[PDB]
Design a binder for this molecule. Structure first.
Ligand SMILES: CN1[C@@H](CC(=O)c2ccccc2)CCC[C@H]1C[C@H](O)c1ccccc1
Ligand SMILES: CN1[C@@H](CC(=O)c2ccccc2)CCC[C@H]1C[C@H](O)c1ccccc1
Ligand SMILES: CN1[C@@H](CC(=O)c2ccccc2)CCC[C@H]1C[C@H](O)c1ccccc1
Ligand SMILES: CN1[C@@H](CC(=O)c2ccccc2)CCC[C@H]1C[C@H](O)c1ccccc1
Ligand SMILES: CN1[C@@H](CC(=O)c2ccccc2)CCC[C@H]1C[C@H](O)c1ccccc1
Ligand SMILES: CC(=O)N[C@@H]1[C@@H](O)[C@H](O)[C@@H](CO)O[C@H]1O
Ligand SMILES: CC(=O)N[C@@H]1[C@@H](O)[C@H](O)[C@@H](CO)O[C@H]1O
Ligand SMILES: CC(=O)N[C@@H]1[C@@H](O)[C@H](O)[C@@H](CO)O[C@H]1O
Ligand SMILES: CC(=O)N[C@@H]1[C@@H](O)[C@H](O)[C@@H](CO)O[C@H]1O
Ligand SMILES: CC(=O)N[C@@H]1[C@@H](O)[C@H](O)[C@@H](CO)O[C@H]1O
Ligand SMILES: CC(=O)N[C@@H]1[C@@H](O)[C@H](O)[C@@H](CO)O[C@H]1O
Ligand SMILES: CC(=O)N[C@@H]1[C@@H](O)[C@H](O)[C@@H](CO)O[C@H]1O
Ligand SMILES: CC(=O)N[C@@H]1[C@@H](O)[C@H](O)[C@@H](CO)O[C@H]1O
Ligand SMILES: CC(=O)N[C@@H]1[C@@H](O)[C@H](O)[C@@H](CO)O[C@H]1O
Ligand SMILES: CC(=O)N[C@@H]1[C@@H](O)[C@H](O)[C@@H](CO)O[C@H]1O
Ligand SMILES: O=C1C[C@@H](CCc2ccccc2)CN1
Ligand SMILES: O=C1C[C@@H](CCc2ccccc2)CN1
Ligand SMILES: O=C1C[C@@H](CCc2ccccc2)CN1
Ligand SMILES: O=C1C[C@@H](CCc2ccccc2)CN1
Ligand SMILES: O=C1C[C@@H](CCc2ccccc2)CN1
Lengths: 205, 207, 205, 205, 205
């Protein structure tokens, strides 16, 4: 409506989507979780797993807040992600670019909270040779910021989700785990956090 | 015409295609139907169906109206979708990005009714293991707004179409049903609607 | 060309490539030719034919005309098509997006006659089951405006043209017929013309 | 550096990369050569050859000159090709879009001489049926302007050799020729020049 | 943050990403190294190797420097590579475009030192006919500037890395060397440096 129209004019004014929305040297906290939907394929030769998954990501951008009293009815807006700052999360062991399956929009509410929930297909490097054993194969999907350390971008995970995994796949899901690590590199004194999702699966029968 | 050109210059003036055209607390009603054109392939190993279908979407955008008496002769205009708000409808169970096959333009008439009618190829997760049986395989093509709840974007469904299904495919179309649902999610305050097209089909040569 | 450079500055000024250049209730006539160059492949399982063809499309855009006396020497110019209104021609039974193989330019002369001549590869739905028989397979390649009716866009066809068919294909091009129809739809008062190119072909072996 | 920065501000001023930089009725002479690097594959069923080649293209853009003593040290610059007018050269018998393998930058020196030297992968229509015979298969890769005739764009060849042909492929070169022609087409009163690279090759062994 | 935002406004104002940041008598030194992460596939028929690798590239762009006291808290910023000058490094023997697997961002600090660390998947021409043998197959991945000679772009290599190579690939990484070379072409007075990465590998047994 007219109030959203006006809201967009205001927020866009000096907004720079290339600048991480830190304030007073405090990190932007980014919440992150992966829901595995489908294992599409495994390449036992080239050691690759092909997966479809749902990412849940959220963080606050203080430059995107407003008073609902100034914009009655407007509690949250749908925004193209290209028009706002987004975490530069990399899939560490991807061997293909992500194919984003869903509209590239984020949800923003009046306290500046952003929710971005893409469904994604992507291939990853993985030792899939256990895929026929009862042990099964174990694949790690590792994500983290490519250019921001812990003190700029504080990546945290939220509860994992398996309810969405399709039941009719030829791969059975035996276990999925999530953990947050902080790793140090010779380059820098600050750590870089990453969230790793560990999937254990096997062929049915 | 010269009047159509004047009309673009006005309909552009304060229009933001990123903003859903709700008015006065009222949701935008979006009518939606799918017509199955062809089942291109089934992947029995990976559980995927590859379909070409024609979507009919229409809604009213009250910011896109004009008096015909001011712009005489202009009953309607064809507008690239990137110049107007369009519903962020997503295929919930798709495993590939949609490939839009037709010009990305929408028809808009003087009372702001918009019609966007793309043809699309896309692949969906589906249990196709029964494709070789008499009862066939059943696939749910489930669509809904990715970000807009019911009270902003009121998704309604209109009468389907089977008449466009190509007769020479190796897949016999045994039926297509469509239903609108609406649920609450634990995440959010407002309910969300979706329209699901259920397609049952089998290989003509299954025996 | 200095005069050419001035002509571009001037022509752009009030030009809107989204506006069909009808004038005085008259439809824009669009001449449409298709020259089949090569049948790349047939998929007998999925019922698809993969073709390379040359489209010739011309029409007059009255907003693109100029006085040659004002721009001496400038009789025709070569212009990116993205800067011009172009007919929204759809391939009705295509199952892939068109791959345009040639520079995306159109010729425009001083009376505003545009010629756009892309070479295109594209896959179409087709019953190719008879391809190995003596009768061969028949594929219809159907095109028409997606959003403009007859009184706005008058699609006219030109000579059938088989001369570009490569002679070393494994497919023998029996013949190519063509027809224009004005189809009515329940939705609308006005008909929408389409041109259909019917291609009959068979394996040389 | 600083002089180069100042040069850009001047050069960009009225520059239109959509406008062929002719002058005084005279064409823009464009030199062209092709050096074949590798035949990647042949498709005997669909009659296609997949090649990687090196184009050497050069021409004079008279709007891109400057006095070197006005910009001391600046004798040539690397410019993205999207900023420049470039010849609208097409591969007449390509069946795929060209895949440019190298940075899209052209060298431009102070008298307006432009060199653009892309390495390209591309598939062409070709009768490759004789590939396993002694005489081999002969493919013609034909290039020319898509929209400019002889009197606007004077395409000339320069000599090339086969030095860059990779020696460890499964194909050997039996013959290579490269020639410029000037033909009339049914459409136009003006001749259009082309350059054709004719390669004859066969499977080793 | 507010100071990062003011920093972007300031830099953008005069920055030109098309100008190489040389100064009179000083080339831009560019540091370069390749870490092989995985050999995805070898094509023994067409002579291609498909590899995933991490490039580390750095250089100083004096135009990107700022005074830290004018921008307290801001020691470094993440910048989209498309906003800055980047070395035009080409893969000499690549037969496909690079597929960049990581966010296209570089780290820039207050001295104007730019670090760009992309993960890349790319296919190269290589004689892999020895891959099943004892001595294995040897591939040269050759990189260097496509258009800048030594006195403009001083390409230099740094310490290599094998640590990242995946231990579960079917290919056993035997040896890896890197060398910086300087080559003259008949065309040009000035030499063009390249860094070449030599990989020896074999199928596991
Ligand atoms: C990019 N790198 C850190 C920075 C850094 O290393 C670095 C910084 C500056 C100079 C040299 C190296 C930032 C956080 C991500 C990390 C990624 C890891 O390297 C990596 C690279 C390639 C494959 C897997 C993992
Ligand atoms: C996106 N989601 C609702 C929003 C929401 O969940 C949500 C919102 C905010 C926070 C956390 C979750 C809105 C309506 C669509 C629905 C989609 C479905 O989840 C879904 C997820 C993954 C694959 C298929 C379908
Ligand atoms: C799009 N349609 C006409 C418009 C219209 O139908 C229509 C208009 C408004 C409302 C509902 C339907 C315009 C001319 C093209 C025609 C196309 C055909 O439907 C069609 C759709 C999908 C595959 C093949 C053919
Ligand atoms: C494009 N065409 C000429 C232009 C022209 O014909 C033309 C001009 C104006 C109107 C109608 C046709 C210019 C020079 C190249 C020539 C190309 C060849 O036809 C051709 C067509 C299809 C595939 C391969 C080659
Ligand atoms: C582009 N070329 C040099 C310049 C130059 O040759 C050249 C310059 C001017 C005119 C003619 C040729 C610059 C440094 C890179 C070198 C590339 C090599 O040729 C080459 C070409 C094709 C595949 C692999 C390698
Ligand atoms: C202004 C407003 O609606 N407040 C909410 C806050 O309570 C919530 O934590 C966040 C999403 O979790 O979005 C915001
Ligand atoms: C993630 C976030 O910022 N939200 C928190 C959440 O713990 C709480 O539930 C919400 C109120 O509903 O607001 C606050
Ligand atoms: C959204 C809308 O207004 N739908 C209209 C309907 O009310 C009307 O009865 C019909 C015929 O006039 O055309 C359509
Ligand atoms: C004002 C006008 O152009 N009339 C039509 C109207 O009859 C129809 O209800 C609506 C939806 O199709 O489109 C408009
Ligand atoms: C499409 C079109 O306008 N065709 C015209 C034709 O009517 C006319 O004879 C000539 C100019 O005299 O130009 C051509
Ligand atoms: C001034 C001029 O030559 N304009 C001609 C016009 O007469 C012709 O109708 C059109 C179509 O052929 O092409 C052009
Ligand atoms: C069009 C032109 O000027 N080119 C030639 C160029 O090949 C040659 O290298 C140089 C000799 O001075 O100038 C001349
Ligand atoms: C000022 C200058 O050096 N201009 C050169 C010219 O000598 C040469 O003919 C041409 C081809 O290299 O490049 C340009
Ligand atoms: C102010 C500052 O940190 N300057 C740094 C310098 O210390 C370092 O040698 C270089 C590479 O890291 O980047 C620059
Ligand atoms: C590349 C560069 O300029 N950096 C140098 C480097 O030799 C040194 O180790 C560093 C220490 O901070 O700063 C300085
Ligand atoms: O804004 C975004 C997009 C989202 C994509 C996740 C991803 C990126 C690259 C490779 C794999 C997955 C992360 N943040
Ligand atoms: O925003 C849009 C895109 C257009 C296409 C419909 C679609 C989207 C996603 C998956 C399948 C189909 C409708 N509205
Ligand atoms: O401006 C244009 C492009 C031309 C393309 C024809 C086409 C469209 C869609 C599918 C296949 C071919 C039509 N008008
Ligand atoms: O500016 C340019 C691009 C270069 C590409 C040549 C080409 C085009 C189309 C198919 C094959 C090769 C020519 N001039
Ligand atoms: O311009 C660039 C791109 C970036 C990546 C290097 C590269 C280019 C082409 C093929 C492989 C790798 C460095 N500089």
């Amino acid at each position: 409506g007219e109030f959203q129209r006006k809201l967009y004019k205001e927020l866009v004014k000096n907004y720079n989507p290339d600048v991480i929305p830190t304030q007073r040297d405090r990190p932007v906290t980014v919440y992150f979780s992966l829901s595995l939907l489908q294992i599409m394929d495994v390449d036992e030769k080239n050691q690759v797993v092909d997966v479809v998954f749902w990412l849940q990501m959220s963080w606050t951008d203080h430059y995107l807040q407003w008073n609902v009293s100034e914009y009655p009815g407007v509690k949250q807006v749908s925004v193209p992600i290209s028009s706002l700052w987004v975490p530069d999360l990399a899939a560490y062991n991807a061997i293909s670019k992500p194919e984003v399956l869903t509209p590239q929009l984020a949800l923003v509410n009046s306290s500046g909270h952003v929710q971005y929930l893409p469904s994604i297909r992507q291939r990853f490097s993985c030792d899939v040779s256990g895929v026929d054993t009862e042990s099964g194969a174990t694949c790690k999907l590792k994500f983290g910021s490519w250019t921001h350390h812990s003190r700029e971008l504080d990546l945290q995970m939220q509860e994992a989700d398996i309810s969405g995994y399709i039941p009719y796949s030829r791969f059975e899901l035996v276990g999925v785990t999530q953990k947050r690590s902080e790793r140090f590199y010779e380059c820098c004194k600050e750590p870089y956090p990453d969230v790793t999702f560990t999937v254990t699966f096997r062929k049915k029968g």
